């Protein structure tokens, strides 16, 4: 909201100060990758 | 002897029938060939949309 102003009780996160005084936000978890790379000790069973 | 070979051909003529029986029966009771795949794995692309 913005006090002294009738435009109040809206939703969203403002662009005025999105950090809320914090140096950073963090999100942590697992990473699962399937990539294509060279091959070694192969050409047979 | 050298005519015994003709006599032997005649005598053993019966095996023609056994060979025909082989030819006709094996082709009805043959097992489907299964391939040994290569040492690689035939990978390609992923499902692209």
Chain A residues with CB within 8 Å of chain B CB: 42-45
**Number of H-type helices and E-type strands within chain A:** 0, 0
Solving technique: cryo-EM
Please state, in angstroms and rounded to a whole number, the distance separating the CA atoms of residues B6 and B1: 9
Give the resolution in Å.
3.4
| CA proximity to A2, closest of A24, A32, A12 | A12
Min Cα–Cα distance to chain B from A43, Å:
6
Min Cα–Cα distance to chain A from B33, Å:
21
Contacts of A1 (CB under 8 A, 6+ apart): A8, A9, A10
Sign of the four-CA dihedral B19, B25, B28, B30: negative
């Amino acid at each position: 909201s913005i006090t002294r102003t009738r435009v109040s009780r809206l939703y969203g996160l403002p662009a005025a100060n999105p950090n809320n005084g914090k140096e950073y936000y963090e999100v942590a978890g697992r990473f699962s990758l399937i990539s294509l790379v060279p091959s070694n000790d192969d050409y047979q069973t | 002897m050298a005519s015994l070979i003709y006599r032997q051909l005649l005598t053993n003529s019966y095996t023609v029938d056994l060979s025909d029986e082989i030819q006709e029966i094996g082709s009805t009771k043959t097992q489907n060939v299964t391939i040994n795949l290569g040492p690689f794995a035939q990978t390609g692309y992923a499902p692209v949309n």
